[PDB]
Design a protein around this ligand. Sequence first.
Ligand code: SF4
Length: 81
Amino acid sequence: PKYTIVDKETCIACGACGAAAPDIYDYDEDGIAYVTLDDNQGIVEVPDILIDDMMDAFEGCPTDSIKVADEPFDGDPNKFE
Ligand code: SF4
């Protein structure tokens, strides 16, 4: 499986990820991205049909703020660092 999460501490509010993967990422009132699948907790497996969009958003993010992993993040975007 795949899980994804935004590191809100590094996001620069550029609007690219919601364009790449609108069913996965949206934004708070200040434009900081978050994963809508699971309220940015990194615990809901990304649907198979959405993985390619997820990878577009992940690869495109200018500040490497989107994380992807094969195990849940359990709330911590920096778990695998
Ligand atoms: S693409 Fe990256 S920097 Fe831009 S809004 Fe999404 S998470 Fe933030």
